[PDB]
Amino acid sequence: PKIHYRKDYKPSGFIINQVTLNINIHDQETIVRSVLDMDISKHNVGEDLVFDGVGLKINEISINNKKLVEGEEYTYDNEFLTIFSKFVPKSKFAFSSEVIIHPETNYALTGLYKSKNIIVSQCEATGFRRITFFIDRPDMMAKYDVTVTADKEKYPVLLSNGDKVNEFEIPGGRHGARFNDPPLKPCYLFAVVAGDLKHLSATYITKYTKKKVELYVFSEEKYVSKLQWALECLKKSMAFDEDYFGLEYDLSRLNLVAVSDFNVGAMENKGLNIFNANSLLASKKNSIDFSYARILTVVGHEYFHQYTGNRVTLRDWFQLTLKEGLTVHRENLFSEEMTKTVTTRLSHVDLLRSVQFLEDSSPLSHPIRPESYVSMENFYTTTVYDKGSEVMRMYLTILGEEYYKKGFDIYIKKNDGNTATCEDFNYAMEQAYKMKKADNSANLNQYLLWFSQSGTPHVSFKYNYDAEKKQYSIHVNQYTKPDENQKEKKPLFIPISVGLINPENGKEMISQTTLELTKESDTFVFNNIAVKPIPSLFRGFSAPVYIEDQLTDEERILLLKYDSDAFVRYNSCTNIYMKQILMNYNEFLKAKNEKLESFQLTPVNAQFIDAIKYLLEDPHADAGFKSYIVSLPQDRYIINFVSNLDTDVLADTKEYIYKQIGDKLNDVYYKMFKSLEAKADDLTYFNDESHVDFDQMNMRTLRNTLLSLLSKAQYPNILNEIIEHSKSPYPSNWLTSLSVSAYFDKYFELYDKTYKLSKDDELLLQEWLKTVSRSDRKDIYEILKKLENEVLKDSKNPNDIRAVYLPFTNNLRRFHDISGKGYKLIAEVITKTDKFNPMVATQLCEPFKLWNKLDTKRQELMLNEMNTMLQEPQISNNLKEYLLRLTNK
Ligand SMILES: CC(C)(O)C(=O)N[C@@H](C(=O)NO)c1ccc(-c2cc(F)c(F)c(F)c2)cc1
Ligand SMILES: [Mg+2]
Ligand SMILES: [Mg+2]
Ligand SMILES: [Mg+2]
Ligand SMILES: [Mg+2]
Ligand SMILES: [Mg+2]
Ligand SMILES: [Zn+2]
């Protein structure tokens, strides 16, 4: 297995200037003819001409219209086409080929494939070589002239990149369309779509050049009524890039296409963005509330790539975070501005500190710019995306909005139309840094360590107040644990957004301040501080670190009630919960280990419970924020703080804490559940697919969170409310009614009721599957077998497989059954899926990422299943390399 190394980058000895394709789709095969107009580069040293080409059936290959002969002049091993150098011209030449591929049976969903009745491509990262021969790497920029032909009745809509410059009829009921795309692009941005697509369209007029842009959103005919929100989101995305960054769309048309079978969320092919249907299609009758934020962020994300990824592209794949981290950051700015809810930023932090922090303390830990790879299909990680986004966001925190925008424009103007590297972005930010500091000696050299250093920094604090001097000191320390990528970890440039809260009146004591920690430790002193403050640390979550605030629970309660920053309030609550969890966990663990017949548990802090009540009863407080404060931290956040975590003991710990708080607040919860109904479930705009109210959706989140707490608590007669909830028109509500009925004898009645409501919409049925999968049922293993036999069957749709199994793996008590039967079940699914879709098989490995953090018995059980999977003779390259890294083999 070849290992590619970042330091080994070298430009190709060849140039591809023009790609001319004819893609002829037939019933049993697709014929791809390609002419490459090529040249010899200045780096050429007379090497063989080697093309990437995977799984291609060669009809012929030619150079300058002379047919080449296998064996004497070229070899092909189903991976690399080698033309021996004595037959390679020494000046401009044409290479041509005709190959046969088979999209109908391409169940790995890479290259050219068939999703239901739509022919569709997915070429990032190295999938273009599955369509035709190429030097398949993003620095090989070329012009593209693409003709597609197909049966007209089956495939009336034909799409590719660029302008449609001809449409024509063909004998035998066929037709063709020619697309010319003159701007240079890398081959991973090529795309083609053919199908019986229906659409919605609009015209957007750009802000400055006043150019008309045609916007088209496409789906199969059955779901065309679910396209309107995506179209609205596209218009919003275009306006945000104009308003915040001054950036306008450059092309005459932008197409968005939904397909049912897709490995990820969506893909930014130039002018032809292709989406998992679950990230483009929604309607209020057939989608849960989460769909609306998902579509907004994914449409936005693919649109923002037109600059950060498409117009400025990548020199090589080790620069992936340059487009993905930066585009996620742009997506998050956009989403925060559109939703106008503090929970948007909180949701991103919550994902980072659970899923990404787990990755970064796992054997899979890597920097956002790795040093090596074997499989590109495994490279697309929450580290590269979400830690990358936080590294991109930290520049905005350091520079402020005005100077950030200045540096960003420098990046765009200098690199537009070219490949780029992470250093090009740091350089642009550094220019803005020198301007902000008014110091041409200032630099961001240390900042580059965010790209090369793996692991999560730990930042800890000590404080001093001198009441006579009115002098306050914050002593800060940073530490990153050594790992397999760096034995010695260097201090990073850590920006710490801080406030100082006056504990007597809750007011700010200083102006906005961002401490620049550049050493292993530093002391920040503040004069004229009239009273001892409570510090508000890492406001907005200003660096991707473990925060150790060294605050008392009394101080954290004051921040939770009175601080101005949503994250610090949320984090103070998180930290209070974590202290309680660790304490009760150890108490339960000791009672288990010592086989005690009686023992004590330390109760939940009464003043903390009072503060939760205070915030819940505040009419002016935010409903989304309220739903966070009544929820314990995620299990995958908790596990970063416990060695040899016994999942049963943790489940007992959470159960005790939830019961402690509910024993005091359940009447409050019930009162709010009833009083929130009017606004949360208001039907005024139910039939307006353009009207989306994120505050109202957060009210439903709060109601459904409270109903869950009350149902688990067996609150008197709460089953009455569950049954009435099941009659709500909103799928978020009636699906919640299914999950919370798990604790009652009506569960299977609601199972059948909600199945009937879901089964005729493909995406709604997948949401139903997820709801069943995560149901807190003692008979969940029997229920999953029922799902397999009656609904899932042998579907190869990744959305179906992921819906049935991934939510269940988050069932702390049942997935981690001490028998190991949950580990066995998911391992069987991974191996089955690996036969046809290695990338999705590796996604299904997610539960195993924490294997070496569990108690020694569960470590052994997980390791056995992972070694069993590794022994499968037919294991894919993707899955083998992933499990070898994960098991430290
Ligand atoms: C899940 C998330 C982050 O929401 C998302 O959808 N991310 C997008 C994105 O980055 N869009 O811009 C994306 C697009 C394509 C791939 C990909 C697909 C393949 F078939 C490959 F073989 C491969 F190597 C990579 C991976 C992620
Ligand atoms: Mg083949
Ligand atoms: Mg505008
Ligand atoms: Mg996102
Ligand atoms: Mg289906
Ligand atoms: Mg290792
Ligand atoms: Zn992306």
Numbering used by the authors: 196 to 1084
Text taken from the publication that reported this structure:
P. falciparum M1 alanyl aminopeptidase (PfA-M1) and M17 leucyl aminopeptidase (PfA-M17) are two zinc-dependent metalloaminopeptidases involved in the terminal stage of Hb digestion. The PfA-M1 enzyme is a monomeric protein consisting of four domains and is widely believed to function in the cytosol, although localisation to other compartments has been reported. It has a broad substrate specificity that includes most basic and hydrophobic amino acids, but preferentially cleaves leucine and methionine. PfA-M1 uses a zinc-dependent mechanism to catalyse the release of single amino acids from the N-terminus of short peptides.
